[PDB]
Amino acid sequence: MVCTFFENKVCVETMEDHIRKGLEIIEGLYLRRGYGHFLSKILNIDVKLAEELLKKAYIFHDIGKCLEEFQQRREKFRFHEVYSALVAREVFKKYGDIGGVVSVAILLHHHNWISPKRPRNLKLCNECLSIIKKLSGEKIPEEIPWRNWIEFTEEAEEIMRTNLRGVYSILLPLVVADNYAAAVNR
């Protein structure tokens, strides 16, 4: 099984339980109470696009934990928010500059320094990419798209300088739904 938290070496919180329980906060606390109208005003898009962007932002927020080095070592998931944001930069690139705002908000959801290196294995777990396909509907590249890591940091510093309000509209529902599903399942 694809896991999210191990804490010794055994799977405590699976990937499917962590995404589904946090989607109840994305749907129930936010999307059932008109957060899509709040998102359509800030992100300058329509309502039904903003409701499905927030769902897919939380689904792809922990996809960097699905690396084959992480699921096999069974210990920890350090710099997974870097690997999640690089995948989400490739997936959400069809939505324009708003998808880059989503990719910054996935990066900042576990940042606790304010400098990662390239891992040797970049292939994600194919058992995880089934679960992301069953919940989102898009297609994921099987390897981590290591886009030099420095073309993303200078455009994240551009987005954080100009459009932090659009980032925090995706970041704050993502962090709130992340800590809830980590509290029930663990």
Side-chain angles (χ1 to χ4, degrees):
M1 55 298 298
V2 179
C3 215
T4 314
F5 202 63
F6 277 104
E7 151 86 40
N8 223 42
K9 254 170 191 184
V10 281
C11 187
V12 183
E13 177 189 43
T14 64
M15 182 61 64
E16 198 164 325
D17 291 355
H18 182 66
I19 294 179
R20 270 215 193 103
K21 193 131 287 298
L23 275 168
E24 303 169 7
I25 299 301
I26 294 299
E27 251 291 328
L29 178 58
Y30 295 97
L31 286 184
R32 224 149 53 201
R33 292 171 164 181
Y35 196 75
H37 301 263
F38 184 79
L39 268 180
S40 62
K41 174 201 170 190
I42 288 185
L43 295 177
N44 206 15
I45 54 179
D46 48 297
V47 184
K48 73 142 200 57
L49 180 63
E51 287 188 354
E52 71 107 350
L53 272 182
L54 187 62
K55 289 197 186 71
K56 290 173 172 50
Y58 184 76
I59 289 171
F60 282 79
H61 92 293
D62 271 349
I63 208 177
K65 290 187 170 181
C66 288
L67 213 163
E68 283 183 5
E69 297 192 347
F70 290 150
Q71 297 294 311
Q72 287 166 352
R73 262 71 130 186
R74 299 188 79 103
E75 296 179 9
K76 266 161 192 179
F77 304 92
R78 191 169 177 86
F79 299 139
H80 70 276
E81 72 277 356
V82 167
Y83 307 142
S84 318
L86 287 175
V87 172
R89 192 182 112 88
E90 194 64 41
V91 173
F92 291 89
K93 75 175 189 185
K94 61 179 189 175
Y95 297 107
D97 280 352
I98 306 302
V101 156
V102 173
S103 185
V104 168
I106 294 180
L107 176 62
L108 299 170
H109 87 284
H110 264 155
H111 203 345
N112 264 253
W113 276 61
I114 64 145
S115 305
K117 247 293 183 177
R118 179 208 193 273
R120 297 99 46 198
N121 193 9
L122 289 182
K123 178 168 176 54
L124 293 155
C125 210
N126 272 24
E127 206 168 302
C128 162
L129 261 61
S130 303
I131 318 174
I132 310 295
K133 265 207 68 177
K134 287 155 195 283
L135 289 162
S136 66
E138 318 218 352
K139 192 48 206 167
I140 314 110
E142 291 183 341
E143 290 205 26
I144 296 290
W146 191 259
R147 195 45 205 276
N148 209 276
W149 159 247
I150 213 174
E151 303 154 348
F152 183 49
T153 46
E154 58 183 304
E155 76 180 310
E157 285 180 25
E158 168 73 28
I159 283 174
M160 282 185 301
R161 181 176 56 248
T162 62
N163 203 9
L164 193 72
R165 181 164 193 248
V167 164
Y168 258 57
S169 67
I170 308 293
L171 171 63
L172 292 194
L174 250 59
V175 174
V176 156
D178 200 56
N179 308 339
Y180 180 82
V184 187
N185 303 340
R186 294 130 65 162

